[PDB]
Short mmCIF file of N, CA, C and O and ligand atoms in Angstrom, two decimals:
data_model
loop_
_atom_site.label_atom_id
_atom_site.label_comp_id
_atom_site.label_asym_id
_atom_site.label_seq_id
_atom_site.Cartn_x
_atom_site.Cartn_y
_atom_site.Cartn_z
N UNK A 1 2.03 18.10 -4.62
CA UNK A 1 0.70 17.51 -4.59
C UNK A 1 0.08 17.58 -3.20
O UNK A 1 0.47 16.80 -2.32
N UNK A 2 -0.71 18.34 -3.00
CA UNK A 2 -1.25 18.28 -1.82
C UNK A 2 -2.70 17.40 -1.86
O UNK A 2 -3.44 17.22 -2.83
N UNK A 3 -2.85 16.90 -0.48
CA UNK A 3 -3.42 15.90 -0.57
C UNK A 3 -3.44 14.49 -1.19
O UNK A 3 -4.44 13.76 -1.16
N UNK A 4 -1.98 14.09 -1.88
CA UNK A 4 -2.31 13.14 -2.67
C UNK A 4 -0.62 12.82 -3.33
O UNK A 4 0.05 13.44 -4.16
N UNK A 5 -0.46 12.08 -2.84
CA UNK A 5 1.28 11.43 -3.67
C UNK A 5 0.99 10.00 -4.62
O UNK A 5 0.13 9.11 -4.63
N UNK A 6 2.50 10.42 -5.57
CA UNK A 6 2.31 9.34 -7.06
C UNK A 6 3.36 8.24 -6.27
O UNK A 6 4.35 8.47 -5.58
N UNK A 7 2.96 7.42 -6.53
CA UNK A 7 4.29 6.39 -5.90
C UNK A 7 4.14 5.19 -7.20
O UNK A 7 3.08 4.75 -7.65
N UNK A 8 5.90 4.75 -7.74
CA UNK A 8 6.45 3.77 -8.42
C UNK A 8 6.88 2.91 -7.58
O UNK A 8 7.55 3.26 -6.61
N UNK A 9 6.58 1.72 -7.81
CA UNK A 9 7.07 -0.11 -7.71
C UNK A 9 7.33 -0.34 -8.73
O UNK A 9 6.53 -0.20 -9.66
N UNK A 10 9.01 -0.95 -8.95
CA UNK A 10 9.49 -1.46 -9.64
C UNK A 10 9.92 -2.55 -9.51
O UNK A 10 9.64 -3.13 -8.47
N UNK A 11 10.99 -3.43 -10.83
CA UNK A 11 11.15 -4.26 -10.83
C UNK A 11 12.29 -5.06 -9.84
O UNK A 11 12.73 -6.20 -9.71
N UNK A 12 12.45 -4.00 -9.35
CA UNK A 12 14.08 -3.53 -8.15
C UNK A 12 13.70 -3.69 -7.42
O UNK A 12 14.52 -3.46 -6.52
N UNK A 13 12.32 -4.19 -6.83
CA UNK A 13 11.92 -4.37 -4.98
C UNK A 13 12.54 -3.00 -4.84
O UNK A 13 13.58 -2.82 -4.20
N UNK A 14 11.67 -1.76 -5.63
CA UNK A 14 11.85 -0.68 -4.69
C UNK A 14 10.40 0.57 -4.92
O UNK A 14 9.94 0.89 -6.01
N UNK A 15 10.05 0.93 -3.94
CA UNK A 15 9.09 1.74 -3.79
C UNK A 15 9.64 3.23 -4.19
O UNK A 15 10.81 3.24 -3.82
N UNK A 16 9.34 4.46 -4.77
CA UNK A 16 10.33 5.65 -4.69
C UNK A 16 10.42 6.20 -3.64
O UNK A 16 11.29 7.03 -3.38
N UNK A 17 9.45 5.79 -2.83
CA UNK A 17 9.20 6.81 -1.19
C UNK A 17 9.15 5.69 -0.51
O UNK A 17 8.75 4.60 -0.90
N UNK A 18 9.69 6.05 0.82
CA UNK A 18 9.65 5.26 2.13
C UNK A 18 8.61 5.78 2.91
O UNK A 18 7.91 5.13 3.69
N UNK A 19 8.50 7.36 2.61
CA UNK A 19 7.95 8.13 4.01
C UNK A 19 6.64 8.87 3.00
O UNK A 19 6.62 9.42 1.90
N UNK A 20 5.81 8.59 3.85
CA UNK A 20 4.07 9.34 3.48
C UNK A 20 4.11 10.42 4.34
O UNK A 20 4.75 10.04 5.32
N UNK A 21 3.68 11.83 4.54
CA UNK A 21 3.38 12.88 4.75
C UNK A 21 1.63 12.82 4.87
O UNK A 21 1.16 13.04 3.76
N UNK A 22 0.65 12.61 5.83
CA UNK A 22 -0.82 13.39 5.25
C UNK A 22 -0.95 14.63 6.22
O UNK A 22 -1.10 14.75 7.43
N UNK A 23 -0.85 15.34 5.33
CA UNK A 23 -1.65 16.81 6.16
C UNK A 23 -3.05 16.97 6.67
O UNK A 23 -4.08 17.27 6.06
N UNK A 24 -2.76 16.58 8.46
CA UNK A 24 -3.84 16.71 9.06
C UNK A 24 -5.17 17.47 8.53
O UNK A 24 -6.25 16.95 8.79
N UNK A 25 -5.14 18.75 7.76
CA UNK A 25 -6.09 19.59 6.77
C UNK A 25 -6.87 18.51 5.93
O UNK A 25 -8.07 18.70 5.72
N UNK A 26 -6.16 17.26 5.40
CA UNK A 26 -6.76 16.84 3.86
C UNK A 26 -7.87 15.72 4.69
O UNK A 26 -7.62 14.98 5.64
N UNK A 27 -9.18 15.92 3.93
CA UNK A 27 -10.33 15.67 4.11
C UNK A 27 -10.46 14.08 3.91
O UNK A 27 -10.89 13.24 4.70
N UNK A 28 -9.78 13.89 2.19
CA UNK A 28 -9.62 12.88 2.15
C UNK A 28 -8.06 12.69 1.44
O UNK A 28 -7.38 13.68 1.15
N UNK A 29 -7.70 11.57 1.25
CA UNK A 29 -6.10 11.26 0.57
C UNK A 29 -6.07 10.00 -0.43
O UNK A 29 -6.39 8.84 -0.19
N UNK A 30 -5.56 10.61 -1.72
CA UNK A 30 -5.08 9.66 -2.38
C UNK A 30 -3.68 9.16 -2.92
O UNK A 30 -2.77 9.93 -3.25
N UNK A 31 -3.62 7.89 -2.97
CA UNK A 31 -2.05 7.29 -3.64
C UNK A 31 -2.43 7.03 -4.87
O UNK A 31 -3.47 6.51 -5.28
N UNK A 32 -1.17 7.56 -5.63
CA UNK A 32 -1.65 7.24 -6.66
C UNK A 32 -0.74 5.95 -7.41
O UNK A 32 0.18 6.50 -8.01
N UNK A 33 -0.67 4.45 -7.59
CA UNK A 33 0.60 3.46 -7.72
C UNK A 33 0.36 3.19 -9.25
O UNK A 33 -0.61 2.99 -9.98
N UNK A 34 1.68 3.27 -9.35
CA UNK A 34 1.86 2.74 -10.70
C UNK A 34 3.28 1.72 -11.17
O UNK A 34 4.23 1.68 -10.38
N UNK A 35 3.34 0.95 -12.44
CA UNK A 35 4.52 -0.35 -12.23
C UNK A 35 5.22 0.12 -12.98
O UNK A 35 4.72 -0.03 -14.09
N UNK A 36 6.35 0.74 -13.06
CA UNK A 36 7.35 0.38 -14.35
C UNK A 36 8.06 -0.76 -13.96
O UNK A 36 8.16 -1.24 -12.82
N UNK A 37 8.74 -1.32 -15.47
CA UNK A 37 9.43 -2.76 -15.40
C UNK A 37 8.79 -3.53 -16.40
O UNK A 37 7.86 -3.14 -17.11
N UNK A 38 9.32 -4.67 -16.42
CA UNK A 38 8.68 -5.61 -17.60
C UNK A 38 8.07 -6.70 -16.70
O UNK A 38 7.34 -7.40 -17.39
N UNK A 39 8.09 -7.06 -15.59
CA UNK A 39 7.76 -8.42 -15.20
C UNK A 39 5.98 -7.93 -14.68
O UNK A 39 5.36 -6.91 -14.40
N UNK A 40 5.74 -9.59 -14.81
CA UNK A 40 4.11 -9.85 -14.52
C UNK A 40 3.74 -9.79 -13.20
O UNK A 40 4.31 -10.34 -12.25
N UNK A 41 2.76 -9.11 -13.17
CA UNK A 41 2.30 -9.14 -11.82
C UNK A 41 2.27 -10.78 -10.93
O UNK A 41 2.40 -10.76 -9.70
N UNK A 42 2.16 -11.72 -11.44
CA UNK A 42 2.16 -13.13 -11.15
C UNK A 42 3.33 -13.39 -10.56
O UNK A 42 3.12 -14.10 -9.58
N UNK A 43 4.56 -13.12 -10.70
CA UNK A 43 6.10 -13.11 -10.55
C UNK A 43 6.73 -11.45 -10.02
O UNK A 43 7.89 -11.06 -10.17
N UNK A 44 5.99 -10.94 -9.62
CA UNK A 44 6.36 -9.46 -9.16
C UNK A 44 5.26 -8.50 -9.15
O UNK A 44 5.37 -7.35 -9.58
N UNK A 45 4.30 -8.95 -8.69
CA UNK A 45 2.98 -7.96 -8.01
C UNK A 45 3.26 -7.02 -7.39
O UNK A 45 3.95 -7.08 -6.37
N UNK A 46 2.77 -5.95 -7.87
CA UNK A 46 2.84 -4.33 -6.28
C UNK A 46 1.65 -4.38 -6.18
O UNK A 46 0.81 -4.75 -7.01
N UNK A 47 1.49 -3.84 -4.69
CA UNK A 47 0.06 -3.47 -4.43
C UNK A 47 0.25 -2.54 -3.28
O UNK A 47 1.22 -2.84 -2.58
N UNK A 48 -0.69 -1.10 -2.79
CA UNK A 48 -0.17 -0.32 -1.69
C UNK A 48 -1.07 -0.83 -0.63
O UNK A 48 -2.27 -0.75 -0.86
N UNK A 49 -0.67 -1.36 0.58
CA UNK A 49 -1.71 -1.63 1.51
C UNK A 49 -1.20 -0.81 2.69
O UNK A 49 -0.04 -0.75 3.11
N UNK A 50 -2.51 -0.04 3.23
CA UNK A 50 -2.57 0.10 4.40
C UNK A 50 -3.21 -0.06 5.49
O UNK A 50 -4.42 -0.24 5.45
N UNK A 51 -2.44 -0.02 6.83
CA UNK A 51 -2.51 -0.29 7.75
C UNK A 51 -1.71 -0.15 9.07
O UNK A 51 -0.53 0.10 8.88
N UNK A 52 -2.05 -0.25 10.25
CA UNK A 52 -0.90 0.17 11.37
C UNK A 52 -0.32 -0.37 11.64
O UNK A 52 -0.75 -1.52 11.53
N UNK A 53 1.17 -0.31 12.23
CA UNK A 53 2.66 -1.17 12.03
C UNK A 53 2.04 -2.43 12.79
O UNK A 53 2.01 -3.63 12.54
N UNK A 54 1.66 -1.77 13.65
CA UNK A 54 1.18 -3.55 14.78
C UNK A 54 0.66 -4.50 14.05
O UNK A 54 0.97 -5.64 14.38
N UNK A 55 -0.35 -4.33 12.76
CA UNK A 55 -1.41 -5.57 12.36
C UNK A 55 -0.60 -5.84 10.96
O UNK A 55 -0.95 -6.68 10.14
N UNK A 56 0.60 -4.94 10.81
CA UNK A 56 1.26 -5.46 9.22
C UNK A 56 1.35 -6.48 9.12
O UNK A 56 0.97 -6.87 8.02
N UNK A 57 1.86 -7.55 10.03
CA UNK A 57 2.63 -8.85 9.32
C UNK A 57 1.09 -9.99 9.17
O UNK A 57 0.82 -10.75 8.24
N UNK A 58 0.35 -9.75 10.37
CA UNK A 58 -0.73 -10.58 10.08
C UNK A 58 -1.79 -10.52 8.60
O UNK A 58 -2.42 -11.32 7.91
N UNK A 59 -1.56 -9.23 8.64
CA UNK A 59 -2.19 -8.62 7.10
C UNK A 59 -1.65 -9.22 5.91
O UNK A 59 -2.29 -9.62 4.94
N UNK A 60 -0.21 -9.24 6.13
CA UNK A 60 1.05 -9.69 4.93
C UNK A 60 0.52 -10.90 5.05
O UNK A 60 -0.40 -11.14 4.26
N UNK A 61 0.95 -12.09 6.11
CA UNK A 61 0.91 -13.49 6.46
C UNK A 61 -0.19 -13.89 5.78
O UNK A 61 -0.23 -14.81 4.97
N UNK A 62 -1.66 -12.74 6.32
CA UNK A 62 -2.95 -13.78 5.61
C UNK A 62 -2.78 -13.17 4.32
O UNK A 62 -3.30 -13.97 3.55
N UNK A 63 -2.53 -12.62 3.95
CA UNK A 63 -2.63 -12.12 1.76
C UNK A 63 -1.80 -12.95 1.48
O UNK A 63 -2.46 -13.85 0.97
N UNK A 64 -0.43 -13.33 1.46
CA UNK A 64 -0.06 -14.39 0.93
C UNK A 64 -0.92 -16.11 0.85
O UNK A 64 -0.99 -16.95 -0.04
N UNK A 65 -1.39 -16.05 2.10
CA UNK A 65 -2.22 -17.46 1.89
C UNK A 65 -3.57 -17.25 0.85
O UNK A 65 -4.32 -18.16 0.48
N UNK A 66 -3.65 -16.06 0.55
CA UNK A 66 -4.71 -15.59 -0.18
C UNK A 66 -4.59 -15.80 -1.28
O UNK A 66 -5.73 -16.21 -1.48
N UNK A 67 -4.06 -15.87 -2.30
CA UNK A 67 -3.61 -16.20 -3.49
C UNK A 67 -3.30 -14.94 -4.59
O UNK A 67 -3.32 -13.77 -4.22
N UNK A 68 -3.01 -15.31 -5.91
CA UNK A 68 -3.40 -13.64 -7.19
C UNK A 68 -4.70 -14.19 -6.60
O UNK A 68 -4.75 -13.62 -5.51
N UNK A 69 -5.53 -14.79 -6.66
CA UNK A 69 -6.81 -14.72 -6.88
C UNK A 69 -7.45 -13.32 -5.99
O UNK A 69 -8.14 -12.37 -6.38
N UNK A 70 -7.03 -13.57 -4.98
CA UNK A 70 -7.39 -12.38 -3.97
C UNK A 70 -6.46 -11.21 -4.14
O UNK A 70 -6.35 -10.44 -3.18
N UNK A 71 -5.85 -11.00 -5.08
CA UNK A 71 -4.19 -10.25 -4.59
C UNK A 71 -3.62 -10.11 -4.25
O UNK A 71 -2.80 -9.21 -4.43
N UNK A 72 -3.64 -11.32 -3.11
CA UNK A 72 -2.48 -11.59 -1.94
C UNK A 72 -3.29 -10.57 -0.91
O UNK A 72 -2.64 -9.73 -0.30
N UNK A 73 -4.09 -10.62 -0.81
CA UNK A 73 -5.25 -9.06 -0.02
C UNK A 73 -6.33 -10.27 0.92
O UNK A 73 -7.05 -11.07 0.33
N UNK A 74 -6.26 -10.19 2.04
CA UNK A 74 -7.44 -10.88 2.74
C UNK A 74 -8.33 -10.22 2.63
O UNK A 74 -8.30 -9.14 3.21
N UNK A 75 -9.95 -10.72 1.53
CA UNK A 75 -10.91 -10.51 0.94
C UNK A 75 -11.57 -9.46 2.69
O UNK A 75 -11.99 -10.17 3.60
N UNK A 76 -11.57 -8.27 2.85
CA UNK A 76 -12.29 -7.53 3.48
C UNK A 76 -11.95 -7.59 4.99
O UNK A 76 -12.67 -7.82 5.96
N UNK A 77 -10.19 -7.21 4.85
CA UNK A 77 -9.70 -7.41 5.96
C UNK A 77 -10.00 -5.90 7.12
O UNK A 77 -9.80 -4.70 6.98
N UNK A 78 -10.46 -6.61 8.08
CA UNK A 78 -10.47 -4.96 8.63
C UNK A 78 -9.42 -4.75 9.24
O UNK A 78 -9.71 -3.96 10.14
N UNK A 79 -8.63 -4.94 9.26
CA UNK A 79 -6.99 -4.44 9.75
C UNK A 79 -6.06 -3.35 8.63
O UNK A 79 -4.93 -2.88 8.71
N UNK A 80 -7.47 -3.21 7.30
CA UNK A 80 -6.59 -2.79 6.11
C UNK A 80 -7.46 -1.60 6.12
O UNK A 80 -8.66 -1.64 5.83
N UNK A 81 -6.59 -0.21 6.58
CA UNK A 81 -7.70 1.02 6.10
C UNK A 81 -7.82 1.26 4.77
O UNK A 81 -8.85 1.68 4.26
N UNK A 82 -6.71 0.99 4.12
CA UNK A 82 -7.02 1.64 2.66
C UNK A 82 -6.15 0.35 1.52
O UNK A 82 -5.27 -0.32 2.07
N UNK A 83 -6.32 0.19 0.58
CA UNK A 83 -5.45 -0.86 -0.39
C UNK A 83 -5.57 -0.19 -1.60
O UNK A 83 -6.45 0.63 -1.89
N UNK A 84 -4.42 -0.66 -2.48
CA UNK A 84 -4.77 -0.65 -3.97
C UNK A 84 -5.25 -2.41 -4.79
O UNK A 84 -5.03 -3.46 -4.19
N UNK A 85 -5.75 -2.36 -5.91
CA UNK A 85 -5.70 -3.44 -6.31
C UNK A 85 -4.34 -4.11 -6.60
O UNK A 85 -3.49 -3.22 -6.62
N UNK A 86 -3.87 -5.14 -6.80
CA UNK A 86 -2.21 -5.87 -7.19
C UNK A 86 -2.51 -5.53 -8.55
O UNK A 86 -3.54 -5.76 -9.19
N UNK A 87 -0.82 -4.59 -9.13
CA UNK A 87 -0.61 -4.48 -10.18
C UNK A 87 0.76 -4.93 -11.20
O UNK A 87 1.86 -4.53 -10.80
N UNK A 88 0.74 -5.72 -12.47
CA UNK A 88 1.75 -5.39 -12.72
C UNK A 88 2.26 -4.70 -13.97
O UNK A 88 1.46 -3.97 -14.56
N UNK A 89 3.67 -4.86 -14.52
CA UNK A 89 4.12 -3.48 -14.82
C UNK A 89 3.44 -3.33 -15.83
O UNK A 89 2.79 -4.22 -16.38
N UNK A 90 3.56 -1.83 -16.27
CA UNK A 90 2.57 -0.98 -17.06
C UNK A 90 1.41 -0.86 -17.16
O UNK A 90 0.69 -0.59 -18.12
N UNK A 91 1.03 -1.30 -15.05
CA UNK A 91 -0.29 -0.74 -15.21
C UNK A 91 -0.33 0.35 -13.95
O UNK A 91 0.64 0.78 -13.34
N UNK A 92 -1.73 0.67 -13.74
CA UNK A 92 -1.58 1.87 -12.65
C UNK A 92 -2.80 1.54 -11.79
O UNK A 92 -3.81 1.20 -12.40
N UNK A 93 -2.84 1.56 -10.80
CA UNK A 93 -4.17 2.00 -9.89
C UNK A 93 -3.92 2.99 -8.30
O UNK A 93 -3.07 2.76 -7.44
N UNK A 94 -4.75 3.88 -8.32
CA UNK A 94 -5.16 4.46 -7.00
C UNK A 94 -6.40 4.36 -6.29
O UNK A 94 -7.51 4.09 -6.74
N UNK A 95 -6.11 4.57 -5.34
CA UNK A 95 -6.90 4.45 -3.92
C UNK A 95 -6.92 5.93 -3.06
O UNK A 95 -6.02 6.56 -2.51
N UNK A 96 -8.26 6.13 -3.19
CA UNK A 96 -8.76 7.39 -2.16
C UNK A 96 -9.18 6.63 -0.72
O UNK A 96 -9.57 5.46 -0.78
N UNK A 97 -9.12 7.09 0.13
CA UNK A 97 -9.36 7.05 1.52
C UNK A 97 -9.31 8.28 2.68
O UNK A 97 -8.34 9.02 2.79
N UNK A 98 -10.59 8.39 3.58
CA UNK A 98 -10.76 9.47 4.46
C UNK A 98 -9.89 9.59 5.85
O UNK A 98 -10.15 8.84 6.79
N UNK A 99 -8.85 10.54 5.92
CA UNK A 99 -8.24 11.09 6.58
C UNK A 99 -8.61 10.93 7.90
O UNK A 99 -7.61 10.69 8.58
N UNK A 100 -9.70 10.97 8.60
CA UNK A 100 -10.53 10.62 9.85
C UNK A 100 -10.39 9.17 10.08
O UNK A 100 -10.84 8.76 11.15
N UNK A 101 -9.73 8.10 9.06
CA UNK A 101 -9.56 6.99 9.27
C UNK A 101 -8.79 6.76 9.79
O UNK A 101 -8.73 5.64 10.30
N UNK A 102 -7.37 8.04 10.05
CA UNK A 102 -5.96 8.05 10.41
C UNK A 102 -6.22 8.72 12.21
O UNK A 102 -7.04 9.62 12.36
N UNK A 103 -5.59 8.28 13.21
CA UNK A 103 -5.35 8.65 14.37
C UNK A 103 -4.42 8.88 14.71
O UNK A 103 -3.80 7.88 15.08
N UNK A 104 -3.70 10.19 14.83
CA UNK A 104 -2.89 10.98 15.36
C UNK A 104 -1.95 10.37 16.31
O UNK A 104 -2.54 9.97 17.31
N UNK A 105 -0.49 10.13 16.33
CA UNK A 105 -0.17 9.64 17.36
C UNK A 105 0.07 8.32 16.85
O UNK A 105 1.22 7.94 17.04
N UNK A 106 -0.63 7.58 16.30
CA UNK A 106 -0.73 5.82 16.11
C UNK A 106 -0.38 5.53 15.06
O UNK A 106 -1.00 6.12 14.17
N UNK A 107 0.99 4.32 14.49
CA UNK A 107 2.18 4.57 13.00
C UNK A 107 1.36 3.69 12.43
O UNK A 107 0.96 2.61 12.87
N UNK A 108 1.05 4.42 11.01
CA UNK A 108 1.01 3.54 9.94
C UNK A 108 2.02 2.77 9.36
O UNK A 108 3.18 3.15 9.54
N UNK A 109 1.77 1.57 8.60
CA UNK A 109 3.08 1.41 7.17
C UNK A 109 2.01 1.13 6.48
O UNK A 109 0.86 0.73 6.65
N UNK A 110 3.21 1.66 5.10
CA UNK A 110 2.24 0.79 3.82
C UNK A 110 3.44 -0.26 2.89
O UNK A 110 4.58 -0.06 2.48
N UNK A 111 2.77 -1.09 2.86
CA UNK A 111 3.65 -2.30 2.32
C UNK A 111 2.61 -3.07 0.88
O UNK A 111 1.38 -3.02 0.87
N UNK A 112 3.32 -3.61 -0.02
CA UNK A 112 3.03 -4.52 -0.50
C UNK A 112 3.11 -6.17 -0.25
O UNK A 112 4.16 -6.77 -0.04
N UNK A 113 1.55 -6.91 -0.32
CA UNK A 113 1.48 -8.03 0.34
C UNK A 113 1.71 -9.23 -0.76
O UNK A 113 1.50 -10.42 -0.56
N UNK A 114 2.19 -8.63 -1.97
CA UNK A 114 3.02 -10.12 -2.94
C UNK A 114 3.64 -10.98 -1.41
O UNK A 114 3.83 -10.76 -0.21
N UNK A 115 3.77 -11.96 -2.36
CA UNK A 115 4.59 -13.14 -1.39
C UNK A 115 5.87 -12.85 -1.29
O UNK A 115 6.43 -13.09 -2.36
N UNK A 116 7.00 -12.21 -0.03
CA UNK A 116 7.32 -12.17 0.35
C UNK A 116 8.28 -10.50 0.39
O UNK A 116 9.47 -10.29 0.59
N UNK A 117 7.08 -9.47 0.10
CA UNK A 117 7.93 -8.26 -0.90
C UNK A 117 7.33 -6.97 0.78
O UNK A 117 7.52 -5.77 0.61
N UNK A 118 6.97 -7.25 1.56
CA UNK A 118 6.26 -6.60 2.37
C UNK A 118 8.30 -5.86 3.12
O UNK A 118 8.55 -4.66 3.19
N UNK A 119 8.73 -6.33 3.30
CA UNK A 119 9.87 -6.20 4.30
C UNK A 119 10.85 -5.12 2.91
O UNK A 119 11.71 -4.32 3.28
N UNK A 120 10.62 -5.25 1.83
CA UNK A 120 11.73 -4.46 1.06
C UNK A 120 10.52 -3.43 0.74
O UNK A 120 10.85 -2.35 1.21
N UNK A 121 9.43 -3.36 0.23
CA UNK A 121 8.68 -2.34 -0.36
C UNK A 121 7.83 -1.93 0.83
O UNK A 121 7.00 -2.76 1.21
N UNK A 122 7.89 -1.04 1.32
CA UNK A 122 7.31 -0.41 2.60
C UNK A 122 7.95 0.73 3.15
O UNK A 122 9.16 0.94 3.04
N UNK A 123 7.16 1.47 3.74
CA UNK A 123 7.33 2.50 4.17
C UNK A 123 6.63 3.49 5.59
O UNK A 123 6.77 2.97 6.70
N UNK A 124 6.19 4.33 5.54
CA UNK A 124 5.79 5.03 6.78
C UNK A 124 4.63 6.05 6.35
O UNK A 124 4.58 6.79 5.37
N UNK A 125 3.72 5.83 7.39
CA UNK A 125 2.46 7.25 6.47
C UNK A 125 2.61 7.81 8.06
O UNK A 125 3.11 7.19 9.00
N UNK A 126 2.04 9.14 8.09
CA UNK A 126 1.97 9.78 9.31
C UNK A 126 0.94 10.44 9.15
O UNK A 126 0.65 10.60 7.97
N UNK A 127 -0.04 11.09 10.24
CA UNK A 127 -0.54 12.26 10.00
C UNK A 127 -0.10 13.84 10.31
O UNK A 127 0.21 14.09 11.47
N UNK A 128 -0.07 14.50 9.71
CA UNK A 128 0.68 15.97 9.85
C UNK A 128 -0.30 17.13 10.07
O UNK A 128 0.12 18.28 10.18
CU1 CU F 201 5.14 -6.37 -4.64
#
């Protein structure tokens, strides 16, 4: 898939990928998340958030005080370049976002901001 990776959250606190690849070339980039598992998003929410390693935990910290209501997502955080909506299992959502948002040199992660799932489901985006 160029330009664009499928990523599973499951019921295992596990993401299938740790590590994001974007090829400096792609204009724009999409994730594409989806839940297998049986549990409710209420009791086991995924959601893909991004952002750079430095502002993760404050990002995590305020979405949890945020509630489902917000998705555990601080309503129009600018520390967040790109998010998905919170999903749970057997559902799907992606998120497009522009490549020019990413700076060379400077680490992303992407984590999910459920209450307390950021430290097991997360990973690394780069630009390439
Ligand atoms: Cu989660």
């Amino acid at each position: 898939a160029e330009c664009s990776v499928d990523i599973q959250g499951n019921d295992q606190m596990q993401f299938n990928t740790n590590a994001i690849t974007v090829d400096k070339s792609c204009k724009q980039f999409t994730v594409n998340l989806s839940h297998p598992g049986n549990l409710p998003k209420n009791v086991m929410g995924h959601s893909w958030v991004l952002s750079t390693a430095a502002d993760m935990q404050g990002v995590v910290t305020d979405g949890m005080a945020s509630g489902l209501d917000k998705d555990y997502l601080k309503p129009d955080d600018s520390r967040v370049i790109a998010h998905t909506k919170l999903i749970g299992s057997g559902e799907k959502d992606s998120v497009t976002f522009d490549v020019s948002k990413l700076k060379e040199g400077e680490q992303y992660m992407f984590f999910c901001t459920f209450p307390g799932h950021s430290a097991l489901l997360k990973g690394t985006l780069t630009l390439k």
